[PDB]
Design a protein around this motif. Structure first.
Motif, short mmCIF file in Angstrom:
data_model
loop_
_atom_site.label_atom_id
_atom_site.label_comp_id
_atom_site.label_asym_id
_atom_site.label_seq_id
_atom_site.Cartn_x
_atom_site.Cartn_y
_atom_site.Cartn_z
N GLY A 58 -22.86 26.10 23.85
CA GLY A 58 -22.23 26.49 22.76
C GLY A 58 -22.54 25.75 21.11
N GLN A 59 -23.54 24.76 21.39
CA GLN A 59 -23.57 23.91 20.19
C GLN A 59 -24.70 24.53 19.31
OE1 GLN A 59 -23.40 19.37 20.62
NE2 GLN A 59 -23.92 19.88 22.58
N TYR A 60 -24.67 24.30 17.87
CA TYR A 60 -25.61 24.48 17.02
C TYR A 60 -26.74 23.33 16.54
CZ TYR A 60 -22.76 28.80 16.16
OH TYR A 60 -22.21 29.88 16.78
N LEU A 61 -27.71 23.58 16.23
CA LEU A 61 -28.75 22.58 15.89
C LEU A 61 -28.23 22.39 14.27
CD1 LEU A 61 -31.11 20.75 16.41
CD2 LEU A 61 -32.50 22.49 15.75
N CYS A 62 -28.35 21.20 13.57
CA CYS A 62 -27.99 20.86 12.38
C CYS A 62 -28.90 19.92 11.95
CB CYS A 62 -26.46 20.66 12.01
SG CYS A 62 -25.34 21.77 12.55
N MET A 63 -29.25 19.88 10.51
CA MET A 63 -29.87 18.65 9.97
C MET A 63 -28.89 18.16 9.04
SD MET A 63 -33.50 18.32 8.31
CE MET A 63 -34.38 18.66 9.73
N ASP A 64 -28.56 16.86 9.10
CA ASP A 64 -27.59 16.25 7.94
C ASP A 64 -28.50 15.90 6.70
OD1 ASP A 64 -28.82 13.38 8.29
OD2 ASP A 64 -27.75 12.97 10.03
N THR A 65 -27.62 15.13 5.73
CA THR A 65 -28.53 15.06 4.60
C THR A 65 -29.33 13.90 4.46
OG1 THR A 65 -26.31 13.54 3.75
CG2 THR A 65 -26.76 16.05 2.87
N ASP A 66 -29.57 13.34 5.63
CA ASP A 66 -30.57 12.06 5.74
C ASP A 66 -31.72 12.70 6.63
OD1 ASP A 66 -30.09 9.55 4.47
OD2 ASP A 66 -28.02 9.85 5.45
N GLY A 67 -31.72 13.97 7.02
CA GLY A 67 -32.73 14.59 7.80
C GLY A 67 -32.75 14.43 9.25
N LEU A 68 -31.53 14.12 9.63
CA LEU A 68 -31.70 13.58 11.14
C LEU A 68 -31.05 14.77 11.85
CD1 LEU A 68 -30.43 10.53 10.20
CD2 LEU A 68 -31.34 10.51 12.87
N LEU A 69 -31.42 15.58 13.01
CA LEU A 69 -30.91 16.68 14.12
C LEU A 69 -29.67 16.06 14.61
CD1 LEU A 69 -34.18 18.14 14.93
CD2 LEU A 69 -32.93 19.02 12.93
N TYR A 70 -28.75 17.16 14.85
CA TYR A 70 -27.55 16.80 15.69
C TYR A 70 -26.87 18.16 16.03
CZ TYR A 70 -24.26 17.83 11.75
OH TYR A 70 -23.53 18.57 10.77
#
Length: 142
Positions: free
Chosen positions: A67-79
């Motif tokens: 159920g997780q969503y790919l995201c990119m934080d303000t530093d450009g790293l995916l999580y």
């Protein structure tokens, strides 16, 4: 408004997919603890992804296993995130009239892409740009 082109790839979101990257031959993966990277193991249960549209050209990349969503934080790293937020939308575009590329909507103006290095680790938003092999993906059937 748009900071990028609007060539869209052929396809649909009816079924999940695998996101293969020729750069090192990895399948983008979203591990259980939120870790994002790639793996060459097609049997891995965390590479099955279900994409879905928001506005035309926009997609959510969700792990079907957790159920997780790919995201990119303000530093450009995916999580991987449990729920959607203001940084999980990506611009799905055709590239070189063949591949699929995923650009961070939130960071569209910075040309931050989803990408996988040759060794299997994710790329940092700031270390990606048009023309890299690491940003080229091919959506494959599970």
């Amino acid at each position: 408004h748009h900071h990028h082109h609007f060539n869209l790839p052929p396809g649909n979101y009816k079924k999940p997919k695998l996101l293969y990257c020729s750069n090192g031959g990895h399948f983008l993966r979203i591990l259980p603890d939120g870790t994002v990277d790639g793996t060459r193991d097609r049997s891995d249960q965390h590479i099955q992804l279900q994409l879905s549209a928001e506005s035309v050209g926009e997609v959510y990349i969700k792990s079907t296993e957790t159920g997780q969503y790919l995201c990119m934080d303000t530093d450009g790293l995916l999580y991987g995130s449990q729920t959607p937020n203001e940084e999980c939308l990506f611009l799905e575009r055709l590239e070189e009239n063949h591949y699929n590329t995923y650009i961070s909507k939130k960071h569209a103006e910075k040309n931050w892409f989803v990408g996988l290095k040759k060794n299997g680790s994710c790329k940092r938003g700031p270390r990606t740009h048009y023309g890299q092999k690491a940003i080229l993906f091919l959506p494959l059937p599970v």
